[PDB]
Amino acid sequence: ALRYVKDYSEWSDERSRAALNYFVEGTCAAIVGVDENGRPEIEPIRFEE
């Protein structure tokens, strides 16, 4: 049930968006938090903000 949230939030392709801001910019970042239902969600936050 922890590879449930890696498939709900599409972490399979947004892990390559935190890697491209990790070598060109300095930092990579992400926020993990629970939406309006009971399920948890992981958004990637951009470097520009």
Binding site: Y4, D7, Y8, N37, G38, R39
Partner: protein
């Protein structure tokens, strides 16, 4: 019942229990089913993966006009190995083999009666 994770069907939804993903190409789903059987049959062998289970889901052009000309030969031969077996399995038992319970369970009373007729010529024979 109620929606528990906001899933109004609880039988087949996208997130939980489908997980769409790509795979290499085939022609039909029977041929993709054929590839991960002969790979698995090769390790075990021809003992438990027989015909009609590896010829049927193959990628052979004319097989319906070939699977019925081989199924018939394992049916007109099974009528030989039954009509030749039902006149052995009724003659090797319940006849010529239940009668060993009629000449060896029955001579049991002969050797027993010659004991009771041996109880006589000692006592209450001459007095």
């Amino acid at each position: 019942a109620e929606p528990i994770l906001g899933y109004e069907n609880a039988l087949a939804e996208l997130d939980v229990d489908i997980n769409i993903d790509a795979v290499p190409d085939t022609a039909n789903l029977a041929q993709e089913q054929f590839l991960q059987l002969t790979e698995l049959a090769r390790l075990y062998g021809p003992q438990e993966v027989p015909f009609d289970d590896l010829l049927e889901l193959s990628s052979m052009p004319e097989k319906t006009k070939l699977i019925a000309k081989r199924r018939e030969r394992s049916e007109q031969m099974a009528q030989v190995q039954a009509q030749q077996g039902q006149m052995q399995e009724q003659i090797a038992m319940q006849g010529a083999m239940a009668e060993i319970e009629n000449t060896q369970a029955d001579t049991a009373y002969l050797a027993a009666r010659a004991q009771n007729e041996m109880l006589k010529p000692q006592i209450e024979a001459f007095k």
